[PDB]
Design an enzyme around this catalytic site. Structure first.
Site, short mmCIF file in Angstrom:
data_model
loop_
_atom_site.label_atom_id
_atom_site.label_comp_id
_atom_site.label_asym_id
_atom_site.label_seq_id
_atom_site.Cartn_x
_atom_site.Cartn_y
_atom_site.Cartn_z
CB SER A 26 -0.95 0.01 1.21
OG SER A 26 -1.58 -1.30 1.33
N1 LIG Z 1 -8.60 -14.25 2.27
C1 LIG Z 1 -7.36 -13.75 2.35
N2 LIG Z 1 -6.58 -13.99 3.43
C2 LIG Z 1 -5.32 -13.53 3.54
N3 LIG Z 1 -4.72 -12.71 2.64
C3 LIG Z 1 -5.53 -12.39 1.62
C4 LIG Z 1 -6.82 -12.78 1.45
N4 LIG Z 1 -7.32 -12.28 0.21
C5 LIG Z 1 -6.32 -11.60 -0.28
N5 LIG Z 1 -5.20 -11.59 0.51
C6 LIG Z 1 -4.04 -10.98 0.46
O1 LIG Z 1 -4.09 -9.58 0.88
C7 LIG Z 1 -2.82 -9.03 0.54
C8 LIG Z 1 -2.96 -7.45 0.65
S1 LIG Z 1 -1.39 -6.77 0.30
C9 LIG Z 1 -1.54 -5.09 1.06
C10 LIG Z 1 -0.20 -4.80 1.69
C11 LIG Z 1 0.24 -5.52 2.92
N6 LIG Z 1 -0.50 -5.28 4.23
C12 LIG Z 1 1.75 -5.19 3.20
O2 LIG Z 1 2.08 -4.70 4.30
O3 LIG Z 1 2.54 -5.33 2.19
C13 LIG Z 1 -2.43 -9.60 -0.78
O4 LIG Z 1 -1.10 -10.08 -0.73
C14 LIG Z 1 -3.48 -10.77 -0.95
O5 LIG Z 1 -2.89 -11.94 -1.50
#
Ligand SMILES: Nc1ncnc2c1ncn2[C@@H]1O[C@H](CSCC[C@H](N)C(=O)O)[C@@H](O)[C@H]1O
Length: 215
Positions: free
Chosen positions: A62
């Site tokens: 993000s």
């Molecule tokens: N049901 C689920 N459970 C866990 N992760 C999930 C999800 N659906 C999507 N994602 C994951 O959510 C992630 C958001 S990435 C956003 C940035 C992250 N917090 C950081 O610090 O880099 C993605 O990698 C995606 O694969």
């Protein structure tokens, strides 16, 4: 390197100047874990720009201001028990762990990103972030209930397991919208008088894919 850090200090200064970083805890977290630690080499040159950046497996880390906004809404304190849904790069979980000074649980559904985040956390010296492979729309019952759950993928609705796993008094920060890629950032407070929602404006996160997210 020193040069990358000098550019990051300018980003943090700006975020404070602009009222986005408003607490010493979030400022100090940002200064301890610059975003360049969390992205692939080819993107390190842009890690200080306030924009999202790619990470593997088609996801993104993000934009710094969005991470700051969500941390400030979370009002994190030492010893809180926090669940992050969507580890990605591990950057946000590292920041949370610097504020709460204890074990942080973060769940990621893509194995490649579980490995990416673990490598980034280890290289950065982090020990208290625990990355779990799984469907975080189900939360993470083994360490529930949580003071704050911070979801970094957008959902079609508020997942009931994440409300059930909140302490009364706790809050869920989550993007919700009827588009997979375009949402409203919700602060969902599980208060003694019931669910109270503050809508915090439009955002763009990758979809939350799972049993209580998007199919
Ligand atoms: N049901 C689920 N459970 C866990 N992760 C999930 C999800 N659906 C999507 N994602 C994951 O959510 C992630 C958001 S990435 C956003 C940035 C992250 N917090 C950081 O610090 O880099 C993605 O990698 C995606 O694969």
């Amino acid at each position: 390197e020193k040069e990358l850090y000098e550019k990051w200090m300018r980003t943090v200064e700006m975020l404070k100047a602009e009222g986005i970083i408003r607490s010493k805890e979030v400022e100090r977290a940002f200064l301890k874990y610059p975003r360049y630690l969390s992205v692939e080499d080819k993107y390190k040159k842009y890690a200080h720009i306030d924009e999202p950046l790619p990470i593997p497996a088609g996801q993104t880390v993000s934009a710094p201001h969005m991470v700051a906004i969500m941390l400030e809404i979370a009002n994190l304190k030492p010893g809180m028990n926090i669940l992050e849904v969507g580890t990605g790069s591990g950057w946000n979980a590292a920041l949370i762990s610097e504020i709460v000074k204890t074990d942080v649980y973060t769940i990621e559904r893509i194995p490649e990103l579980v490995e990416f985040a673990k490598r980034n956390l280890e290289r950065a010296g982090v020990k208290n972030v625990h990355v779990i492979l799984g469907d975080g729309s189900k939360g993470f019952p083994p360490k529930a209930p949580y003071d704050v759950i911070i979801v970094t993928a957008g959902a079609p609705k508020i997942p009931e397991p994440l409300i059930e796993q909140l302490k009364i008094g706790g809050k869920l920060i989550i993007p919700v919208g009827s588009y997979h890629l375009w949402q409203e950032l919700l602060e969902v407070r599980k208060t003694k008088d019931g669910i109270k929602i503050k809508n915090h404006g439009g955002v763009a996160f990758v979809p939350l894919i799972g049993e209580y997210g998007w199919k």
